[PDB]
Amino acid sequence: KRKVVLAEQGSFYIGGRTVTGPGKFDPSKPVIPYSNEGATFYINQMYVNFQAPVRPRGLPLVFWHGGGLTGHIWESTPDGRPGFQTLFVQDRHTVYTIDQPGRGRGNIPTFNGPFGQLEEESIVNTVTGNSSKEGAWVRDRLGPAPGQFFENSQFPRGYEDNYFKEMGFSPSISSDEIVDAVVKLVTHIGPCVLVTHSASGVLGMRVATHAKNVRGIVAYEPATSIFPKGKVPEIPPLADKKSQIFPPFEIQESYFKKLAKIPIQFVFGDNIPKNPKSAYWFLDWWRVTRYAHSLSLEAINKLGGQASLLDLPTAGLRGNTHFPFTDRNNVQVASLLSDFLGKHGLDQN
Amino acid sequence: SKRKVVLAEQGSFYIGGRTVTGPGKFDPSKPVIPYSNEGATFYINQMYVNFQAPVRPRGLPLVFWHGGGLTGHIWESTPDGRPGFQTLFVQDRHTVYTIDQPGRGRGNIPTFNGPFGQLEEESIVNTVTGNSSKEGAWVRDRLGPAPGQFFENSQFPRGYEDNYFKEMGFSPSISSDEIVDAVVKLVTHIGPCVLVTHSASGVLGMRVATHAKNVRGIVAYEPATSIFPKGKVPEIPPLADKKSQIFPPFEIQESYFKKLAKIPIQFVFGDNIPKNPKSAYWFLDWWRVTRYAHSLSLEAINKLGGQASLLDLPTAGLRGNTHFPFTDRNNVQVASLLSDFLGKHGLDQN
C-alpha cells in the first residue's frame, strides 16, 4: 500500500558551527558578487526530515544513509516502490530521515574562493574523491563486474540510471563533526533507534557511545569495523595480498562498553564469497570486512552485550545487494527489521 | 497549526542529467578504493524530485522550485517549524512536487577525483565557488536594512535566524541550460502542471514554460532576473550608488517569449521594497529596480496578449513579508492568495 496518514511532517536544520571572514560588512556596498568580507558562514549543519503517524507505537526510528547518499534511499527504491520511510510510518513508528553534514540538504562548507577554502584556512579539501558507476556497481554487489548481475540478484534491473544518480561525493568534513550533529539530534528527539547503512555504521556506533538515548542499532552492511583501543584483532589482507579493508576505528573501552547495553544487529546481503577472490576486489573486500565485523560483535558480546549478525540468506532471502532496503524484496527485509524492533520492545510505548 | 496530512502515495526519484567518462578501462581485480577516474562513468547534473499526492486530487499538480542556494526544505517547513506550502497544498488537494535542482541539495554536485569540478582536463564546474554570507542573505532577503535589524512590520520568524540561514548554501557553476532541461523533462513526465518559483528559479521557470506546453501557469515569488524578447530590453536605470546594476535581463527569441502570453503568470512581491532610491542600502535599492524591471517584463507579456500580473502583498492587506513570503509568519495567508490564483484560472478543478 502506498497510503500514509501523517499526524505531522516537516524538516529542520540542527548542529553545525560558524566560521567568519575578515573585516566588516557594509550594507551600502555591492553585495553581489558575494564576498567573505564581514562574513559569518554557517557550516556543517545537518538536514532532518520527520514523518509521524497517528497513534505512534514504540520508539522513533532515525534512518541514516550510507556514504555518498541521502535520505532519498529511505523514501523510494530506484524503480519507485515505497522505501522504509513509508513502510515504517505504516508500521506506526515516527520516522526521521537525515542528510548528514556534507551530503544532500546538509551543508557543503564552501565560500568565495577555491572549494572549501575560507581565505587561508582549509575547511574542507579542494581535491575531491567520488566513485564511478563502475566502482559502485562492484561495491554494491549488483554483480562481479560492471554491467553484469548475479543470477539471484534482487536489484531492480532496468533502473540502473535512477539508482546511480542518487550517489555523489562527500567533502572532507571531520567524522567528529558528523557524529556531533547526530548526537545533538538524538538529544532533541529523546529515546530512539538508529538504522544505519555502510559508512554510517561506524558513525552510529560512535553516536550510541555518546548518547544514552540510542536504544538500539540496526546496521545494513556497515563499512568500517570498531574495536576497543589497542584490542584490534588480527585481520588478514585481501586475496591480492596487498590491499586491506578500511582501518578499524578504535575507541576507549569505557565508551566501547556502552555498546553492550543495547541490542545491536548487523545485516548482510548475499553474494559475499566464503573464500578469497583475487579476481574481484570488492567481493573479497566484503568477505574480509564482514569477518572483521563478526569479531567486533564478538567483542561486544564479551562485555555482556547482545550484538548479532543477520545474514539475509539464512533468513531465506537470496540475492540482496548492499542496499537491501531498496532491493526488490525490501518488504521482506523490512519485516525482519520489524521483528527485531518487536522482540526488543522497541515497538511498544 | 493544522498538521495532519493524508497521502495516497509519496516518494522521490531522480530525473535528467547526462554522463561523462574518464579515460581507460575499469578492472574489477584492481583496488577500487581510492576511487579512480580510470574507466569511469559519472552521472552528472541530475535532479532530485519528491512527490506527495493527496487522496482524490483536484486540479493540476504543483511543482515548487526553490530559489538560489536553497532546497525543497523551504517548501516543507518554516524555520520555526510551522507547515510549509507542501503540506498546505496537499491539504488543498493538489499533488505536490518539490525539487532539489541540479547542483543543490539532493541534486547532483558534479565533482570527481581531482580538484573540485574537474574531470581530468575537462572543467565541468568551476573549482572557485561563490556563496553569500549570513549578512549578505539578511539584506538580500529584506529581514531588515542591515544585519541584526528588523523592519518594523516584519513577518520573519524572529528567533529562528540560525535555522533559517542554515538552509542556504553555494551552487556550482552548472549551465542554466541544463537546469532548465531537467525541469522540462520533469514537466514532460508529470503532464499539465503549475510552476511555483522563487528568486533565482523565476527566470528558469519562465524558460521552462517556453519549452514545455504542459506548464499551465506560473506563480513566481520575487523573481531575481527579468526576461524580455531579444533586443527589446527597455531602459533600466542603474542603482542609486551610480555604479551598480541589477542582474542582466535574460533575452529569448520572440517566438519563445510569445509562449508566455498563453498562460496565467503572477509575480508576487513582499514588503519593504523602497519606492525611491536608497544609496545607503544596496539590496533594498536593488530590489526597487529589479521589481521595476519585472513590471516592464510583465507589460511586454501583456502587450502580446498575455495574462501576466504583479501582486504586491501589501496591496492585498499583508504587511511585513520578506523575500520568502511562503515561510513567513503569515504564510497561511500567503498560501490563501495562491489558492485564489489557482481557483481563478480553474487550476484547482478536474
Residue numbers in the entry:
A (entry chain A): 12 to 360
B (entry chain B): 11 to 360
The authors write:
SulE, an esterase, which detoxifies a variety of sulfonylurea herbicides through de-esterification, provides an attractive approach to remove environmental sulfonylurea herbicides and develop herbicide-tolerant crops. SulE catalyzes the de-esterification of a variety of sulfonylurea herbicides, such as MM, BM, SM, TM, TrM, EM, and CE, to the corresponding herbicidal-inactive parent acid. The structures show that SulE is a dimer with a lid loop in a domain-swapped β-hairpin covering the active site from the opposing monomer. SulE shows a similar catalytic triad consisting of Ser209, His333, and Glu232 at its active site.
The asymmetric unit contains two monomers. SulE is a homodimer, consistent with its oligomerization state in solution as determined by gel filtration chromatography. The catalytic domain is a typical α/β hydrolase fold, with eight β-strands (β1 to β8), six α-helices (α1 to α6) and two 310-helices (η1 and η2). The cap domain (residues 113–184) is inserted in the loop connecting β4 and α2 and is composed of two α-helices (αCAP1 and αCAP2). Particularly, a β hairpin, which contains a lid loop (residues 31–51) between β9 and β10, is far away from the core region in each subunit, but cover the cap domain and close to the active center of another subunit in the dimer structure. Glu232 Oδ2 is strongly hydrogen bonded to His333 Nδ1 at a distance of 2.64 Å to correctly position the imidazole ring of His333 for catalysis.
